[PDB]
Structures are given as structure tokens and as C-alpha cells.
RNA sequence: AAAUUAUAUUAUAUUAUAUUUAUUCAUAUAAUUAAUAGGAUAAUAUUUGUAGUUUUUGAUACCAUGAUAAGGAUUAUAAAUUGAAAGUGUUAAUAUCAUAAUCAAAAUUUAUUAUUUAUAUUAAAUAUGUAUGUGUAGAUAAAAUA
């Protein structure tokens, strides 16, 4: 007898990913600072998205010329969040970009793909304790632009932690 | 939860005096 | 790995802090107990009402010290540092010199870290005082070496 | 096991004041029968507090680790909370 | 915020392992006069059992 | 007594039943545990000896 | 690891890695010899009318295994992957079994396979003193022979460093020494065979005796020259480091290619499922269980089906 | 505490009774404070 | 610095007694009672052993 | 039916039948995190809540282990010595969770009508008839129904 190796006809491209043990990687739970959503915890998803939009991009490591990290401090001083940035309308973004942020026309062009897709600012769990993984799925208006998948339901700021509790913040 | 591996023939009343590769082939559902 | 889990390191460090608090508090607690529990007069100078008032005042001072270490030494003198197994001081589950349990002592014998000499398990080893009188005679010999050979001054 | 070194530690008429009590009457009451410093209130008192006259006289609350002493009497005065339970 | 369900969630923690997550759906107690005003905060009840 | 097995010319124990910790004359003549073997046990018995020779941050 | 040149010494990332991996020591602890305690005895794995397979599991702290095939007729034994921290049980077993050791098969020349090879040859030849033992190996492993000392450097095997390997001595394939006219223990080893990478089912075998044939298969990916043993009459596949229980060999070592490992796994699909595969490390399995329950083979055949021209499979954490 | 002070009398000297003088430092192994936690007199730990 | 027994601590006992008499008021030290002073309120305080 | 392998020594035991206790069990709990820092008798740095924040405690599996019992042979041609005692080989049954993704049983501490085994308490009863264990233990200085 010669048993055939069980394969599939249609396989998603996520299953083509590499693991050194050819197994499922560990998903370590996030640190105890993310247990309560506070002002120290609110803008860590906004910081990593602006960090990735300014760093090197691709296999050839194309450096993004516009530095969007300089606008992180003035965004958190106004008290606006990445999840609160997706709730702003079109007229509220022209007021935010021109008056407060003073975003130039090329810095506005590098940030707009992150706002056009409505990226869910949820810290994904990873193999390490310090996670720099944000869920890049497109959000829907029924689930608060959180993409509604893997437990990101309308208030979830961090994967594995509690909701937003908007009465406090 | 780990699902235990299963063979077709019952392991009850099997001799343990077999050789090691015979028991190895026997337990992985491909006997000699 | 790696050495031991960190809760056991916290436990051994709390035992060391209890030893340090014993060194901090033992002289003060002993002087307070020896003044406050004495019925004979302290001196020719202080007698009668002055002695009773001083004993009541030192009792008020002794009770006002929150955190004074009055715990005896033998209650938590069986803490092992390498492993989490708890032994009993006085039995064979504890060795006194390297201050580990029987399990840890066997692992450090089988690992080769210590320099220990094996002797027959029904004899008294090699010590002439131990062959002579046992544990009590070596106890008295350590007492005689430490204290009683000195003419006090 | 050594003699009387266990870490986890009865009616008698001729040995009433001498069984599980202090050896001398000259000594003072223990530390739990007095207030050490600034306290926010204790949930329970220790078992070595001597039942005094003011325990049965005032009678605010007696909580021993539970145990509730709501029957005050004078036959308990002068004795710790061990033999009273 | 957990929704009550009766299907377990299977979280694959490795090859041939997974994790079965389902929750037993607590029911409220009876509303008879003996269950009312139960001394839950006490834990040392001395009320006589008729 | 010289005709006993555990002969040491100093009296190792006082012939007194109940010579306990409550007596103040025992408290006065007792050795304090300052710089006895307990001090060596408190400062030496560490679960890792490398935290007794330096600080780890300093060595790294 | 590698040679400390000027660039490696002036690098701060090197000191950062040596602090992260090994703590405050900075030096890697080696792979030591297994002591005489916690060492098990030689087990007889398989008994057959033709051959007898006798093995010992976890004979190194590399967690490798040591196997010997015994011909029941000719009384000739054959060690495969000779790496045991105590080759004194094996010489006593051969002497008490009245056996003759004639050859030692080597799958590949990594340090988990040839660490105690001179000890095997010396002790078994000393017992034969009361024809020498040959070595069967692939010449591509020459590139792993020369780094036997460096691998003995990094894994703390200092007593096996200053030892000329018997595969480096002059065989019949090499020119001979022109000695002064006024010795042959080390000058010439006539019993030595070099296996060829052109392995077929026709003539690529060793006549073990009594009609038992051992087909060596050239299967790279974990090594440039990696030779499995296949006994079709006994359904036994000494895989070495190519295939294990639920895992395959490493590719994150030098001279290891993932697509060579994928081709080596693809040249194994014509054997029956009841062939007991016997790995160099760990527990033994069958080839049908590896066709059904091994994720590396599933990924290899899935990448082959979806259209990858260069399918590259391999482990990065596992057995050396 | 206010109902606890009836059957249990209050003896509160204050925090002055917890800090021994400097002349009693070497008798108490270098310390001055009789707190439940140890008190080091260096600014680096402090 | 003295070492060992309490008989070698002459000045330290004096400084401790002076400090204890300094910080402690007498109106606090009145409240501490002995064992027989509490046992006097018992209806049968005294009997032979 | 022989040779003696045999250890042998003495004592104890239970719901008499109820009560207190050392451990066991029930049900109430407190405890939580990370890192260095040199001071008198030294040719001159005033200095240390400063550089740390998303800090570490996270892989219990089905490998081929090992213990048990049983049978073999060699040496005494000396009356000296404190002391004539020591090494070497084979078969049955039982058994085999260490290359993997976690978490506080008795890691572990403390307490309450309540569950035991032990701890000592603990008694009547001649009308008749009457009440046999396995074991647990200490150091070890008798021997022939097969
Ligand atoms: Zn998402
Ligand atoms: Zn290899
Ligand atoms: Zn290998």
C-alpha cells in the first residue's frame, strides 16, 4: 500500500506561511498594562500605524520619505484616538488636517490609505510579550470599524483584553 | 485536548512479545 | 530551566529578610523582655515605684513597635534555596551544613559539585567524639570550643 | 520530628489558670490586648488576647478567627481565647 | 460581554492539539420564600433549618 | 565525672528543669545572634550565587 | 561557531547576541559526554530469519541513536551512524555474540554521527586483535569532515579535536605514501568504500550476505552527501536525518538546501506504507504514518500541487 | 477602631517610639526604624 | 561597638532606658495591667494547685 | 524419611461503648512582579527618586528503561596466625509517556456545626450458654512428623 499525502484543491495563501517547526506558533497574552483602557493605553495603536507608515516598505525596503511620527504628539494632545479618527467625517478631517495637524499634501497622501481602509487598531497577540502587530483588516460600521473578526467587537482595543468602557474614557 | 491515534484491529489480546519494529508498524496502522 | 522559578526566589529572599529583621530586633526585644519581666530591683538607685513605672513604660514601648521580630529561629530555618521541596529540621529530610533538603543534597552528590566522602551507613563516620558519645557529645564539643575554653573577663 | 516543634499548634478544674496560659501572674497582658498604633480597624483579633472585664462590660464586637462572642459573662475573665472556644 | 452559545470554539494550539472553549450557561435559582434573603455575605449562618 | 563517656571538664548543661526563655536571667546571659552562623546564612544562602558577587546589570 | 575576524570583534550586535543567548556567561555550554549513570543498555529491536537489528536510543546528548545490523548466517555485523558516548557496551556485545565487525555505514558526517568514530574503530580493532573495520561514506561529506574540528570547538568536544579521522587517511582511491626504504596501521586502509551519488535500484547495494541486500539512496538537503539504507526484504529504511517522527531534518546549517530536501522527500514515494522508517534521532515510525500525519510532507506536496517550481521545505529548529 | 477601643485600651506613643537614636545603631545592626519593612539609609535604594 | 552578650552593652542599655523614658508618657503606661489585676474580676480568682 | 534449610525474642491491636485531641478532610482566603550605583588617613568632578518600559516567571509527552525469582563451577592435605575466607557464568514472567506551545495539587499559608484513623479518657455484668487475625514494631546471643 502507498498512502497519498492529504492535500487540498483550494488553499488560502495564509497556510503557505513558514514556521520553523511547521506548527502553530505561540500566542502569548499581552502585558498587564493593557488590562484597562486608559489614556496611556489609548494611543499605542495610533503610534504603531504611524510608525509603519514612515518606515521601510517591502522586500527592497523602500524608505517612506514623509515622516508621520511627528504628528503623533499633537494627535494625542488633542485626545483623539485612532479608533476615534475613523469616526470623524470628511468635513471633520479637513478641519483636523489643515488647522490642527498642518498635514502637507504628501503627508496627507501617505496617511489616507490607512483612513480609507478603516484599519482596526487592535493589538494582535504574538509569540513575544511586546506586540507590534496591528490587525490590518478593513473595519465595518456595524462593529465600530473593528472588522468584526477574531473577537474585535465594537470596543475591543486589545486582543485578549476587555472592552473600551466609554463611561470612563 | 489531544486526540489519540486509532488503528483498525483491536489492541486487546495482542502479544507484547513482538519485536520493536513490529509493534511500531502495528501501532501506526500499517502492519508488516 | 532555568535555576528555580521566581516565586521560590521571592520566598528565599523573604526568609533572608526575616533573618535580617531578627538581627535588627533581637537585642531590643531581649532587653525589653528582660526589663519588663523582672521582679527583683534593677539597681540601688532605681527601686520601688520608679522600677514599676519604668517596667510599665518599657512595656508600653515594647508593645508600640509594629513589626518587631519576636519569631523564634527554628520556625522558618528549613528553607531550601535551590529547590522548592520543604524539609523538616531535626529529621533526615534536611542537612544542616550546606542547608538544603535531602533531595537537593542527593542531586548535588550525584552531580559532583560537593566534595563529600562516603562512609558506611551504620557507623559513626570518623569523628572520635561522634564515635564516643554521638550527636550530643559533638554538640557539647562544639560548645566547649566556641565558648567554654575562654576565661571570661 | 523534634519535640514540640510542630508549626501548626480543654476543661480542667485544678489546672485552670496554669494550662495554656502564662506561667506567672506578675506579667502583663499580651500585645493583642492593646492597640499598637494608628489602626483602621481589625476584622478579627488574635487567639491570644486575654478576655478582660471590659470585654463583657462594654461588648461592642468580639470577632475571633469564625467566632462571635455575643454571650458575655464573668467566668471568662482572665483567660485567653484558646480555651474559651 | 460574552454571548451565550452551545457550540464550542476550537482554538488550534498546535499539531494534533486544540482548545475547546464552551461555557455552561448558568440558570437563576428558585424564587421560593426560603431562598429569598439568603445570607450569602455571612458564610457562617446560624438560622435554624426548618 | 571522669568515669563517664561524655567527659568534658566544664558543666555543659545546668541541672534546672524548666530553664526557659521566659526567665530574664537566661535572657541576660544568652549569646546574641549578631554575627553568628545565621548572618552567614542570611547573606550567603541565595538561589543564585552570581547575585552575591556583583549586580547582574553591572556585569552585563 | 565561526572565525573571529576584525569585523566580528568590533561588532556590538555580536556581544548583544552572546548576552541574549547565554546570559552573563557569554560562552555556549557544549554538548558533553553522557556519563556512566543514566545510560541504558543495548536493545534488540528486530529479530528476523535473515538479520537482527540491535539498537540503543539517546546515546548522545545530541539525542541520536545507534543501530547495528547482524547477519544471522555469516556472523557479520554492521554499525550505521557510529556515534555512541560509550562504545564499550557495543564491543562487549560483539565479543559475547561471536560477531565480526567488517564495515561502518555513515549517512552523513555531521558531529552527531562521527563524534566517537575513532573510539569505535580503535576498541573494535583492539578486540579483533584477540582485516580491519572499514568505513562506508559519501565523498561530498568531505566538506563536513574538514569542519569536524570546528564543530568539536563549538560543542565542547575537546578530547576528540586532535584526532585524524579515518575517512581522511589514505584509502585505495588515493595516492600512496612514498616511505623511506628502511607501518601500515595508518598509512593505508584497504577496507574503505566510497559511495556514489548515482544510486539506483539495480546495482547500488551492499552484499551483506545470505542474499540480504542493502540499497543506499542518495538524498541530500540535510547534507551534500546523505545516504539512506533501504532493506526491502525486511521493510526497513534507515533514513538518518532526512525523516523523523512528525518532522524532517534541519536546513539552517551550512551546505543544506531546502529544495534538495524537498527532492529527497519526493524520491521516497515508491516505497510501501509498511516500511518501518528508522531515523537517526528519536522514535521510529512508518512511511505510511509519515504520508498521513507529517506536516512537512503535506506542505511539500501542497506547494508542488499549487505550482511552485522550486519547492523548499525544511526545519530550522530540531536535530542536527 | 472607635468601637474596638472600648474593650481594648489604646497605647499610642506615636512614630517617635519607632525611631531609635543614633547611639543605638550598632546594637541594632545599623538600623534606627522598627518598621515591618527594612529601611536603608542610602539615597540610591531610597 | 560591643559584641555578644547583653552584659557587654553598658552604654546602650542606659541610652535605651533614657530614650524609652523620654518618648513614653505615663498616661499611656497606666493602662497596661498585669494578669492578676484582670483575674481579680473573676468570681473565683484564687485557689491552690 | 536422613541432611536441616528454619531467624528466633517478647509485647500490642480494634464502637467495651460514649467523650477531648496530632494529621487528614469541608467551607471561608490573604499574598502579586521588574536594574546598577564605589564616602576618613587617596593631588581637588557635590551625585545620584538618575538613566527602565509594550520588563521575566509559558512546550508534561505513549522510544527501544529498569526492578523480581530461579539454577553453575574454583580453593582448603597447614595446628601456625589477632584473624585458614574470597573472587568468576545462564532462563521465565512484569515493565518501558522526555524535541513538545502555558498557567499556583499539599506553588502554598490561615480558619469554621462537620469525615476519619490514632490520643488519652472510659464502665456495668456469675439465672443459664458462650466468644482466638492478618499486620504493625525494636535490637537481634534457642532449633529435626518430612
Ligand atoms: Zn481586526
Ligand atoms: Zn545531520
Ligand atoms: Zn542527525
CSV table of N, CA and C and ligand atoms in Angstrom, one decimal, chain G residues 108 110 112-113 222-223 241 253 320, ligand 2:
chain,number,residue,atom,x,y,z
G,108,UNK,N,25.8,10.6,7.0
G,108,UNK,CA,26.5,11.9,6.7
G,108,UNK,C,27.4,12.2,7.8
G,110,UNK,N,28.1,14.8,9.9
G,110,UNK,CA,27.9,15.8,11.0
G,110,UNK,C,28.4,15.2,12.3
G,112,UNK,N,27.0,14.8,15.1
G,112,UNK,CA,26.1,13.9,15.8
G,112,UNK,C,26.2,12.5,15.3
G,113,UNK,N,27.1,12.2,14.3
G,113,UNK,CA,27.2,10.9,13.6
G,113,UNK,C,28.6,10.4,13.7
G,222,UNK,N,19.8,17.8,4.0
G,222,UNK,CA,20.4,18.0,5.3
G,222,UNK,C,21.9,17.9,5.2
G,223,UNK,N,22.5,17.4,4.1
G,223,UNK,CA,23.9,17.3,3.9
G,223,UNK,C,24.1,17.2,2.4
G,241,UNK,N,19.0,11.4,8.9
G,241,UNK,CA,18.5,12.7,9.2
G,241,UNK,C,17.4,13.3,8.3
G,253,UNK,N,21.7,24.8,8.7
G,253,UNK,CA,23.1,24.5,8.8
G,253,UNK,C,23.8,24.7,7.4
G,320,UNK,N,20.3,18.0,14.8
G,320,UNK,CA,21.5,18.3,13.9
G,320,UNK,C,21.8,17.0,13.1
K,2,LIG,ZN1,22.8,15.8,10.4
